[PDB]
Amino acid sequence: APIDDQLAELERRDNVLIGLYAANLQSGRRITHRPDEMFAMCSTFKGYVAARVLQMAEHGEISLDNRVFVDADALVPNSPVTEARAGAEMTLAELCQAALQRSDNTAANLLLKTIGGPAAVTAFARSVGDERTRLDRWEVELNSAIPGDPRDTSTPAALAVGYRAILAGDALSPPQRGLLEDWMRANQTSSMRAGLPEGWTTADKTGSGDYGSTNDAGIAFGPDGQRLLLVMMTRSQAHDPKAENLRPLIGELTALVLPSLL
Numbered sequence: 001a002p003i004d005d006q007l008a009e010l011e012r013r014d015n016v017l018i019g020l021y022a023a024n025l026q027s028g029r030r031i032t033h034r035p036d037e038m039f040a041m042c043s044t045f046k047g048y049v050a051a052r053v054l055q056m057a058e059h060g061e062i063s064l065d066n067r068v069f070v071d072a073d074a075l076v077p078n079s080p081v082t083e084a085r086a087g088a089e090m091t092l093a094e095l096c097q098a099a100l101q102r103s104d105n106t107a108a109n110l111l112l113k114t115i116g117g118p119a120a121v122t123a124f125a126r127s128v129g130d131e132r133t134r135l136d137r138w139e140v141e142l143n144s145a146i147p148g149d150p151r152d153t154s155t156p157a158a159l160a161v162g163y164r165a166i167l168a169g170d171a172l173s174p175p176q177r178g179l180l181e182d183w184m185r186a187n188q189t190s191s192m193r194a195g196l197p198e199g200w201t202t203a204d205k206t207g208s209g210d211y212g213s214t215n216d217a218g219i220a221f222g223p224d225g226q227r228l229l230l231v232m233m234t235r236s237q238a239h240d241p242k243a244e245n246l247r248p249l250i251g252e253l254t255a256l257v258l259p260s261l262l
Contacts, residue, residue, distance in 0.1 A: 003260050007033045010253070011237075016212065016246060019233035020253065021160035024261045025168060025219070026227055031257055035157035038132070039233035040145030042207030043103045044159060044215045045121055045135050045152070049111045050096040050183065051166040052124045054176045056115065057092075064093040068110050076139050079106035100205060101187045105139040112138060118152075125158070128165035132158030143209030147239065160231040163217045167203055168229070184218060191216040191247045192230055195254030199223030204230070212236035212243035216250050220258075228261055230254065 007018050019039050023030040056062045067089040070082050081098035082090065083106075090098070095111050098104035112118065118135035125133035133154040135142065142152040165171040167181055184203035191206050191214065204218025213235045220228040232250050236243035 003031060003257070004033065006256060010249070010256075014246070014249060015237045016234050016249065017237055018249075018253065019156040019231075020257070021156040021229070021231040022257045022261055023160065023164075023229040024226070025229055026225075027261075029261060031260055032157070035160075036132075036155050038150060038153045038155055039215070039235060040143065040152055040207075040209050040211075040213040041133065041135075041154045041159065041233070042143050042145065042152075042209035042213055042215055043108075044154070044205050044207040044217045044233075045133070045142070046099045046103065046108050046207075047166060047180075047184065047205045047217070048121050048124050048133070048162060049108060049115060050100050051171055051180060052115050052120065053092055053096055053111060054172050054180055058173060058176055062092060062114065064096075065091045067091055068095060068114065070106070070110070074106060074109065076105045076109060078140070079104050082106040082110070097183055097186070100183050101189075103189055103206065109139050125154075125162055128162045128169070128171050130154070130158045130162035130165070133162065143207075143213070144241075145209040145211045145213040145235065147211065147235075154233075156231045156233055159217050159233070160229055163219070163231060164229055167219050168227070181219075191250035192218075192220065192232065192254040194248075194251035195256075196220060196258070208245050208247075210241040210243075211238070212240075212245055214246040214250060220254075226262065228258070230257070
């Protein structure tokens, strides 16, 4: 594969590992790099969490406007929305959008307490065909991303199936899938968005952790109706827990793969 040699070049140049699953949803064409290698998922588990909340609301197990108390003591770094409401209540729907749109960490912990913790996310993964995702810890420990450590990891292929399931498949009844898509489209964190031409938009979840772990998973929507499933997981090859994250590389990856999918 020639796009295969281009990706090996980016790895060499930046001392990174690139995990990629990119599919054109209309043509059924897919492109892959380390699709089955394990990467820390970091905040990308939040889509599955919000998806499961929506599933549970469908059946009346919970309700989206159910209130949850935000304890100041439960606050954890990178919680821009839950911080504003510490000592008060947010609804589950609010917590979902905080987790998805701003990667609010405490929002995700609260959502995890509601749905059954890390094991519930794993079970969810399995329910949608995702056989590699395992969540083991809470925010913010899950982002530790130690090389070789299987905890809180997935693979580009495994995350693609689940992201496809929840945004373009049958995990949710179609109108609730529509809401999940709207929730992710309003996100303020997209990395891939920078490598897309004018007119394109994304329903995607980014993740960032140690060792430069920088992820972005979701669907890119073309102006002319096109639909691209894009899952990018990258980490430094170095044993530097504090290696720089690779946000500009995602955007560069996005622009690189797009012409070979269209």
